Design a protein around this ligand. Structure first.
Ligand SMILES: [Cl-]
Ligand SMILES: [Cl-]
Length: 215
């Protein structure tokens, strides 16, 4: 249970195992890693792209992108469930426990030629808590908050190198315990390195199976 409480020692141990001996601190509901510095190189003369990948257990793994206005998607799109999916009606304001969580957001890369930008791209979607997927607030941050930073940067004509990595406790868990987001703009004005805990205050999750126990 403790592994799905974002502030617990157990969670932090898993985080350390997944990212190495990088410094981290809890702030605004997330973990800032390595003083918010990433080694991503945005100063590369390469065409915008997205690359999704999977690991040896067929789980969504490291995703990379170079983002700019050529693949930005402002428009709307014109049964499948991710690994570990077990929906539960919660006792919190979200109403439900989990969302199909994209590694690389539709709005960011939906215009990239040939790419499966759908909600059922099996290399780009995980079981993600509603809280950690949806929260767009600076005070209590979710993945949406960081996606908004990247989106706003691209909308200001910035080139953003971006890397999103689901963090798993071990080789077999179906559901990641956190989402690692890294971003760097060519001009250096945008840079972050964070882990968004795959947690929700009103319940705990067994990351092995995705089974949720409401508080
Ligand atoms: Cl830039
Ligand atoms: Cl929450």
């Amino acid at each position: 249970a403790a592994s799905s409480v974002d502030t617990s020692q157990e969670f932090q141990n898993n985080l350390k195992n997944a990212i190495g001996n990088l410094p981290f601190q809890y702030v605004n509901g997330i973990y800032e890693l390595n003083n918010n510095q990433t080694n991503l190189n945005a100063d590369v003369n390469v065409k915008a792209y997205v690359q999704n990948t999977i690991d040896n257990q067929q789980r969504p793994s490291t995703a990379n992108a170079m983002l700019d206005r050529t693949i930005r998607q402002y428009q709307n799109r014109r049964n499948w469930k991710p690994l570990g999916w077990h929906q539960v009606a919660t006792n919190d304001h979200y109403g439900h426990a989990v969302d199909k969580g994209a590694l690389i957001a539709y709005a960011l890369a939906g215009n990239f030629k040939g790419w499966d930008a759908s909600v059922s791209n099996p290399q780009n979607v995980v079981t993600q808590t509603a809280h950690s997927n949806q929260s767009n607030q600076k005070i209590n941050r979710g993945q949406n908050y960081y996606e908004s930073l990247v989106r706003k940067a691209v909308d200001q004509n910035k080139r953003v190198r971006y890397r999103v990595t689901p963090l798993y406790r071990n080789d077999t868990d179906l559901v990641p315990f956190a989402m690692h987001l890294e971003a760097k703009s060519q001009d250096g004005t945008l840079e972050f390195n964070v882990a968004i805990p795959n947690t929700q205050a009103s319940y705990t999750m067994d990351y092995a199976t995705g089974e949720i126990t409401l508080n």
